[PDB]
Amino acid sequence: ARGGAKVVIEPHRHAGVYIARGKEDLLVTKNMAPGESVYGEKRISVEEPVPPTKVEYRVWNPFRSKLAAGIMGGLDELFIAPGKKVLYLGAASGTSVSHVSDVVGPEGVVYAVEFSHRPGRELISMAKKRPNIIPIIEDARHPQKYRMLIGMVDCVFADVAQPDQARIIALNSHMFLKDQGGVVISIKANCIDSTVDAETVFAREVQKLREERIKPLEQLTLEPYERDHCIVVGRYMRSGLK
Amino acid sequence: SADKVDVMIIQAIALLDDLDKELNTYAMRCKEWYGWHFPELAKIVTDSVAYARIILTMGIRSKASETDLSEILPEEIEERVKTAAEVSMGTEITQTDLDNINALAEQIVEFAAYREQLSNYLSARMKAIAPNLTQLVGELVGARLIAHSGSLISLAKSPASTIQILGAEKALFRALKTKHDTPKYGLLYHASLVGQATGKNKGKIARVLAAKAAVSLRYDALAEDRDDSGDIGLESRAKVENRLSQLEGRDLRTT
Amino acid sequence: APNPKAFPLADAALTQQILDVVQQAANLRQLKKGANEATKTLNRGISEFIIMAADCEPIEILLHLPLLCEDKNVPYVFVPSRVALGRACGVSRPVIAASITTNDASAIKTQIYAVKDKIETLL
Amino acid sequence: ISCAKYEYEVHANFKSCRNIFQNGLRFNPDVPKLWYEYVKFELNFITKLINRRKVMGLINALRGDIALTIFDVCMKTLGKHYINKHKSDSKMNIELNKETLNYLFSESLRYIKLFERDYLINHVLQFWKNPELYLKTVMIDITLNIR
Amino acid sequence: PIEYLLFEEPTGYAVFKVKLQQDDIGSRLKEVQEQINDFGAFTKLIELVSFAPFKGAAEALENANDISEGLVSESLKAILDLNLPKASSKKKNITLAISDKNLGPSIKEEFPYVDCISNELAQDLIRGVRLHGEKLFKGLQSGDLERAQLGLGHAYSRAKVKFSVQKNDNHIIQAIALLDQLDKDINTFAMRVKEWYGWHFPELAKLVPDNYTFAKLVLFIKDKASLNDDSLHDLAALLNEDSGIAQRVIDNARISMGQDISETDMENVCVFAQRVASLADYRRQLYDYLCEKMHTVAPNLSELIGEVIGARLISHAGSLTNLSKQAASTVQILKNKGRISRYLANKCSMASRIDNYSEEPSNVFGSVLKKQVEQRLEFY
RNA sequence: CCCAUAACCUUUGUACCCGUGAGAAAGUGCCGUUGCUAUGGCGCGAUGAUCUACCCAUGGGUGGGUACAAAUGGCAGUCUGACAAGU
């Protein structure tokens, strides 16, 4: 709540992410870049035992990040792990890419891929601060444009709003994803098509991915924060979907 | 005599800790600028004087590929830095900003050598004022002792077990008000002798060192004709060596 | 080779249609006027879409918005006359940026959605 | 170089050696040593053919120009290579320009040590011009005419 | 008939010769996909024939840009010449596997006798090359793929955003925070030198107020003894004699009762004062440079309010971006004076946005804004 | 060792203080130029009008805060005390 209360931290079922419990509950992560707030977010910090050194944890804004509803809503298995590599289709800014850097931690890496320049400027300055994030400023439909820069990524996330969504995830996954890999989609009915209903759009898109050889494990609706979305968690199998 | 000034000695120790603190934050600022430039130095080495001397030596990654860096850093670290220069993640930085980083690294080297010179002044003055103490326990902890409990004659007036305590008074009074175990070392942990010992031996060496230090202190501050050498200090050290050697040589596992 | 940063401007037809919808919004309280209020509205997240002009003195005051609009995936269009925009707004002065806010309880909701669809097509 | 030296010192199939050298310069133009050995091999084929024409006459400058033009494309390529080797302000550009020119002309004097010899170096000097370095050049001019 | 495949790496290019082309018609089967997974059969499929790396970081950047657009580079043409055999243009075109169906035309128009292939076969094999990666290269490829990757990523992103150094402001943030720390330490070292020489001269401690004249005085005057007429004259060339402080300090030096400090306290307070004066010179220089970089980056701020005030504003902002993105309604700068400050805050918001997004400023409009500021000031 | 190298209060040094969004004020108003009347400037704004204790007739002294400084003010008092180790 206010900027003074004392709270308790807790390791989650998913690694990396922690629960911040006090009088009220929060979703928190560990920050690599100390002391620096990206978008004004209130931060917790702890001493840790040499004298103890100060580390810092950061709230994960559930009204703002389109992945935040994933953990609060509760996915069975999120493939982002404290050692793997994540491909990120559509980093608007720090608002999500910095948090995915914080959950993948030091050893892992994150590739932000985005096209519009001025978010590119904010991106590259943010990566200049934080050393696990490498941004690429190209269009998300041509891994043949950028195929020298990414080596065998472990799990793909996507939050693009363009109507090309199934095809572009199919392209990037077929290029760079490991076998038995993980894929997370954040899909918005209003930005694929309006008149047909949202759930029918969801069925259409999940059917398109099943055609594109990625078998979906589960979906979540993310009702209480933003209206009308879905988060799809699926597995790149490439070999015998059945 | 115009060399016996405890107020200058305590001003020295307070200045010493402040100087270390401000050196640390200044090296932080330099690290952040040259991390907006080129951070693999800041991730390979951390030692402030050596980092700043690299900054004084070379000024750009091409210059690093040109230059040699033998005497500042060992060569495997040097060439790893060179490989980081050959594959950097950085920009190129303007002339005026290079000049300012140069001036800052100059500041850092000056503060480091300045701090070493101030410690030299502290140690020589310590040997001038309370010589037996400097022969026995170490001038850093000697200055810290006088600084904690005030001045020389009062520190002499207090007895030996108090001198074994002096530091951890918070833990002491909490432990006595709550009826738990008293703390043993307190402040005398930072002596070279206790650094030689280990464990329950550290407890015994702690009380022994406090006692012989109390003899050194009472002879030192309340004498008329001090020889200014410290043979009393040396003999206390020798007896302490005998005691430490015997207690470490004593075996606990059966033979 | 690079565009002027007021990318993109619209047809005269889309300009006419947008000016009518913003005038009806001015009638029904769901139009808010002014770049400052546009910025606060984007921060509150209650902004549906953004009209901008391309003629004020100069245009970086209005050019701060594309960052926020692309930040929250909000459609933003351009019209070449701040004085025609003010006439549409029904105010005593030319306006450089206007926000159509969010309400699902509207009389012109469908027209808002229609023109928003047009914007997303022309983007 | 090992390939060329084999094919020349045992066989002297100078044509295949030359094509080896062409593709070698193509793969690595950046190597002043490779430029050095190619110029050496050119001059050795020249003096071999000239001793052959001499022993022909006894039993009874084109080459310098191709050497100097090889020197030309050498210098241009090396200059561009070290420009692109860390290509950025106005004063940065001026000082690094002076550094690069020092580099190239040190290397040109290395070729002078490798040494119509006077005419070849005079071409190098007018090529050079078109401070203390200026004095070094005019020193080389007058001492070369004494030579 | 998929004889050669061509891979590109953050270090360089490489070409592989195929041995055993997979039977295609089953390429949707579990078994051929597990052979594309495991290392056990991939080395049965593909052998190494050549690999030529780049020799410079700028060269890697330029070649990567070249591929990304789709034209062929000099290194690539040389590799193809030294690798691909001499084939015909009418019968048995030599077949090269290649990932980029749009790069295909340039290779075909370059070398007449090679047919590019971008089939799912080729996607399969090049995917396998990416997976088994460094483990295939037998030890040839030196230097981390990871570090080469990261360097090339930063370079490519910067070159396609057209990054600068002028439109950075982290120098402003760090320089102003350093300036604050310098002034804090310079006043605390003023207090410490004040007392630590006041044990020699409390008369000085009360006589002279300025820290810089304090340091200059304990520079020049050694102690309260070695004081003479030319010392008084050079003190007049220093702080003043006409203030009478010179007469006061020499008479208090005659009548002073503190310890005449010895040679070592003397040299130590000397080294202290010299260190403090050096830090003061550095701080003055760095402040002047801060004015310089403000007139460089965003001098509409210095135009409307001032250099250090705009700089304190950017440091509270976190960056020029966030100074712009902050709205003119919740800006906190430093009833009626509230009206004035509300107004100039709005004007400053306009100034920040223009000098943020605009490349180089409009101080004529800065002048308009400041003259309007003085006009609303003459209103109230 | 987690901080008496301080933490907290208290006493003195430095400070200013009760987000909303279209409504305010209510030949000439004040000057300029030119002579045998012609006339020069401006008269609200979306780029934002308006809201964000106690005494004495635009002074002080009380009243309360947070960010910064000094205290040899306060909480606040300095462990046990005759065996051990080898044969």
Question: Which DSSP symbol is given to C52?
Answer: E
Distance of alpha carbon E4 from alpha carbon E16, whole angstroms: 6
Beta bridge partners of B55: none
Give which of E15, E141, E12, E33 is closest to E83, Cα–Cα. E15
Note whether E286 contacts C: Cβ–Cβ < 8 A.
Answer: no
Contact at 8 Å (CB) between C65 and C76? yes
Residues 6+ apart with CB under 8 A from B122: B9, B12, B13, B16, B139, B143
How many CA atoms lie within 13 Å of E321's alpha carbon, on the beta-carbon side? 20
Distance of alpha carbon E221 from alpha carbon E241, whole angstroms: 14
Cβ contact (<8 Å) for D23 and E52?
Answer: no
The residue written with tokens 């712009």 in the block is E324
How many CA atoms lie within 13 Å of A15's alpha carbon, on the beta-carbon side? 8
Give which of E67, E62, E79 is closest to E104, Cα–Cα. E67
Distance of alpha carbon C40 from alpha carbon C101, whole angstroms: 11
Cβ contact (<8 Å) for A119 and C66?
Answer: no
Cβ contact (<8 Å) for B29 and E268?
Answer: no
A240 C-beta neighbours (distance < 10 Å), count: 13
Q: Residues D40-44: contacts with CB within 8 Å, 24+ apart?
A: D40/D114, D41/D4, D41/D8, D41/D17, D42/D66, D42/D67, D42/D70, D43/D67, D44/D8
A241 C-beta neighbours (distance < 10 Å), count: 11
Cβ contact (<8 Å) for E175 and B100?
Answer: yes
- For helices D132-146 and D90-114, give the axis angle rounded to 10 degrees: 20
DSSP class per residue in B17-35: HHHHHHHHHHHHHHHHHHH
The residue written with tokens 């120098």 in the block is E171
Contact at 8 Å (CB) between B233 and B136? yes
Residues of B in contact with D86 (CB under 8 A): 60-62
Distance of alpha carbon E18 from alpha carbon E4, whole angstroms: 6
Beta bridge partners of E95: E115
List Cα–Cα distances, A1 to A7, A21, A54, A105, in angstroms: 10, 11, 22, 27
Question: C47: helix, coil or strand?
Answer: strand
How was this structure determined? It was done by cryo-EM
A3 beta carbon to strand F: under 7 Å? no
E266 C-beta neighbours (distance < 10 Å), count: 14
Question: A152: helix, coil or strand?
Answer: coil
List Cα–Cα distances, B254 to A37, B90, B189, E88, in angstroms: 60, 63, 30, 90
B166 beta carbon to strand F: under 7 Å? yes
Distance of alpha carbon E371 from alpha carbon E366, whole angstroms: 8
Size of chain B, expressed as the number of residues it contains: 255
E362 beta carbon to strand F: under 7 Å? no
Question: Max Cα separation, chain A?
Answer: 63
Residues of A in contact with E153 (CB under 8 A): 111, 134-136, 149
Distance of alpha carbon A101 from alpha carbon A110, whole angstroms: 6
Give which of A153, A178, A183 is closest to A78, Cα–Cα. A183
Residues 6+ apart with CB under 8 A from D4: D17, D20, D21, D24, D37, D41
Distance of alpha carbon A98 from alpha carbon A115, whole angstroms: 18
Distance of alpha carbon C106 from alpha carbon B94, whole angstroms: 56
List Cα–Cα distances, B14 to B147, B154, E198, E279, in angstroms: 8, 19, 17, 20
Residues of E in contact with D84 (CB under 8 A): 56, 58-59, 62
Q: What share of chain D is helix, strand, coil (3-state, %, to 5)?
A: 85, 0, 15
First to last CA, chain B: 58
Handedness of CA E109, E112, E117, E122 (dihedral sign): negative
Q: Give the neighbours of chain A: at least 3 Cβ pairs within 8 Å.
A: B, C, E
Residues of C in contact with A191 (CB under 8 A): 73, 120
Of C5, C40, C64, the CB nearest to E353: C64
Question: D90: helix, coil or strand?
Answer: helix
Contact at 8 Å (CB) between E156 and E148? no
Q: Which residue is nearest nucleotide F76, judged by alpha carbon to C1' distance?
A: B173
Distance of alpha carbon E256 from alpha carbon E259, whole angstroms: 9
| Nearest-Cα residue of chain E relative to residue A178 | E131
Note whether B94 contacts D: Cβ–Cβ < 8 A.
Answer: yes
C10 beta carbon to strand F: under 7 Å? no
Contact at 8 Å (CB) between A196 and A208? no
Best of A53, A128, A130 to substitute, by most chain B Cβ atoms within 10 angstroms, is: A128
Task: Give the pairing of strands A177-188 and A85-89.
Answer: unpaired
Which helix (H) or strand (E) is C51 found in, with range? strand C47-53
Of E327, E354, E356, the CB nearest to C40: E327
Reply yes or no: is the peptide bond before residue C58 cis, omega within 30 of 0.
yes
B151 beta carbon to strand F: under 7 Å? yes
Distance of alpha carbon C20 from alpha carbon A178, whole angstroms: 52
Contact at 8 Å (CB) between E206 and B22? no
Distance of alpha carbon C8 from alpha carbon B248, whole angstroms: 84
Distance of alpha carbon B153 from alpha carbon B217, whole angstroms: 9
Question: Which DSSP symbol is given to E85?
Answer: -
Enumerate domains of chain C plus CATH numbers. Answer: 1-123 (3.30.1330.30)
| Nearest-Cα residue of chain A relative to residue B33 | A129
3-state secondary structure B50-116: HHHHHHHHCCCHHHHHHCCCCCCCCHHHHHHHHHHHHCCCCCCCCHHHHHHHHHHHHHHHHHHHHHH
Give the closest nucleotide to E329 (alpha carbon vs C1'): F19
Beta bridge partners of E34: none
Note whether A135 contacts E: Cβ–Cβ < 8 A.
Answer: yes
Q: What share of chain E is helix, strand, coil (3-state, %, to 5)?
A: 65, 5, 30
List Cα–Cα distances, E309 to E297, E304, E323, E332, in angstroms: 14, 10, 13, 12
Contact at 8 Å (CB) between E154 and E57? no
B245 beta carbon to strand F: under 7 Å? no
Distance of alpha carbon B53 from alpha carbon D122, whole angstroms: 46
Give which of E130, E127, E132, E101 is closest to E116, Cα–Cα. E101
Chains A and E touch, using 3 or more CB pairs below 8 Å: yes
Residues 6+ apart with CB under 8 A from E78: D23, D26, D27, E52
C57 beta carbon to strand F: under 7 Å? yes
Beta bridge partners of E47: E17
Contact at 8 Å (CB) between A87 and E124? no
Residue B167, φ and ψ in degrees, nearest 5: -65, -70
Torsion from C-alpha of A214, A220, A222, A227, nearest 10 degrees: 70
Contact at 8 Å (CB) between E203 and E221? no
Tokens at E81, concatenated = 């010449």
Residues 6+ apart with CB under 8 A from C110: none
Give Cα E150 distance to the centre of its chain.
16
